[PDB]
Amino acid sequence: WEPPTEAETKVLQARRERQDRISRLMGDYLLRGYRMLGETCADCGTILLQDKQRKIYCVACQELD
Amino acid sequence: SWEPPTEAETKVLQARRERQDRISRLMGDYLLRGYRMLGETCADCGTILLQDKQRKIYCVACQEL
Ligand SMILES: [Zn+2]
Ligand SMILES: [Zn+2]
């Protein structure tokens, strides 16, 4: 052990907050009526949602970044 | 019409949320136990990568979940 760097602690806390936000958005859109698909985003790994027969949506890529 | 989320969906959501919480907890622990964060995400799953003290690269999601 040496202590994690301050960099590593910020990135870990960021990564935490991000994932929390992604779960919260996915939940929001499921509640708003979006369909969960059995596929994940090829870019970021996030489970994909579908809005009727209008579109497929990644809450990460297409909203949070 | 709008339709609720299904039993399936809200299960997968709770699961994804648990996964992500565990990834963060695992990542943190490895950081505190001597593993250094890489500026790079797992190509399979998107998770930030670590290296151990023998410079093996290590994805907590892939190689422990
Ligand atoms: Zn994505
Ligand atoms: Zn991985």
Residue numbers in the entry:
A (entry chain B): 13 to 77
B (entry chain A): 12 to 76
Paper text:
Human SSSCA1 N-terminal Auto_anti-p27 domain (residues 1–111, predicted MW 12.5 kDa) was successfully overexpressed in E. coli and purified over a Ni2+-affinity and size-exclusion chromatography (SEC). The purified SSSCA1 construct was predicted to form a dimer based on the elution time when compared with a set of common standard proteins after SEC (estimated native MW of 24.6 kDa). The crystal structure of N-terminal SSSCA1 was determined at 2.3 Å resolution and phased using the single-wavelength anomalous dispersion method, based on the anomalous signals of two zinc ions. The asymmetric unit contains two protomers that form an antiparallel dimer with a buried surface area of 1960 Å2 (‘Protein interfaces, surfaces, and assemblies’ service PISA35), the interface is highly positively charged and is mainly formed by the helical part of the molecule. Each protomer binds one zinc ion coordinated by four conserved cysteines (human residues Cys53, Cys56, Cys70, and Cys73) structured around four antiparallel β-sheets. We were not able to model residues 1–12 and 78–111 in the electron density map and coincidentally, these regions correlate with the intrinsic disorder prediction plot of SSSCA1 and confirm that these residues likely are disordered in the protein crystal as well. A systematic search for other proteins of similar architecture using available online services, the DALI server, PDBefold37 revealed that SSSCA1 likely belongs to a novel Pfam family of Zn-binding ribbon domains (Auto_anti-p27, PF06677) which overall fold is not yet available in the protein data bank (PDB). The helical dimer interface has not been observed earlier for this type of Zn-binding proteins and the closest zinc-binding protein relative from the zinc ribbon domain 1 family (ZNRD1) do not share this. We have determined the structure of this Cys4 zinc-binding domain and discovered that it belongs to a new family of undescribed zinc-binding proteins denominated Auto_anti-p27 (Pfam PF06677).
The human SSSCA1 gene is located on chromosome 11 (11q13.1) and encodes a small soluble protein of 21.5 kDa with a predicted N- terminal zinc ribbon domain type 2 (ZNRD2), and an unknown domain in the C terminus. We describe the general domain organization of SSSCA1 and identify three distinct domains including an N-terminal zinc finger domain, a disordered region and a C-terminal domain and describe that this domain organization is found in most eukaryotes and is highly conserved. The C-terminal domain has a dual function as we here show the inclusion of an unusual nuclear export signal (NES) that overlaps with a docking site to the poly-ADP-ribosyltransferase Tankyrase 1 (TNKS1). Functionally, SSSCA1 is largely uncharacterized although it has been linked to mitosis and centromere association.
